[PDB]
Design a protein around this ligand. Sequence first.
Ligand SMILES: O=C(O)/C(S)=C/c1c(Cl)ccc(Cl)c1Cl
Ligand SMILES: [Zn+2]
Ligand SMILES: [Zn+2]
Length: 234
Amino acid sequence: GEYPTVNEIPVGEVRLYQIADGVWSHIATQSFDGAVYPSNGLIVRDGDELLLIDTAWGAKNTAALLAEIEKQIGLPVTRAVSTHFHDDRVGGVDVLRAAGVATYASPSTRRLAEAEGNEIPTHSLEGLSSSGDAVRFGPVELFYPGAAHSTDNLVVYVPSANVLYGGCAVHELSSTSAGNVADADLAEWPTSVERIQKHYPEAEVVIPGHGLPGGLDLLQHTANVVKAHKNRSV
Ligand SMILES: O=C(O)/C(S)=C/c1c(Cl)ccc(Cl)c1Cl
Ligand SMILES: [Zn+2]
Ligand SMILES: [Zn+2]
């Protein structure tokens, strides 16, 4: 009865975990380049509707996510935001868009998704192109901390619950490296994390893109891991 881990979730199944009143994470697993990884997203209650943050990493997982939401929560998902362009965030957007969900991402994320051959959210989120930018979107704040895991990565804050969803710019405490840095800005990532720390000092829960949620220490840990990664790589 703890947060589910990668070995507890078959590929194709999705679990929900209650984080706060009206805030849940969704957890799925997927195979990528030969290994299996867990991945998180967020669900936030918006009246009698739900806001989804990130897909469940693929069409089949995302269909399973919608079914699990309908079963466990029973409110309609009306909008979704993808927090960067990789398949763990946008894979499944076509399933959402067919199910009548309005899908959103920054123009940067949409253009990078198109270039990569990934699914593309329908609507552009303006006002997030400069580091430190923040905009309101239903029950959350979207924040662009600067380049980190990717140049387009957004974080999401739920002010009613002081929940910070860091997406893939934030690592779990057990992480020992920056992971796949193909699209990363390793020089900027620690500064981007500092911007998050300064902007959301009252966060009570921090949810990484992959792995276990914790407190504010996930932010400092991430900066530490990324600096060490860069040092080892240099
Ligand atoms: O480290 C992470 O959080 C992710 S999203 C790595 C990644 C990369 Cl860099 C490209 C493609 C894909 Cl599918 C993944 Cl999972
Ligand atoms: Zn990514
Ligand atoms: Zn990721």
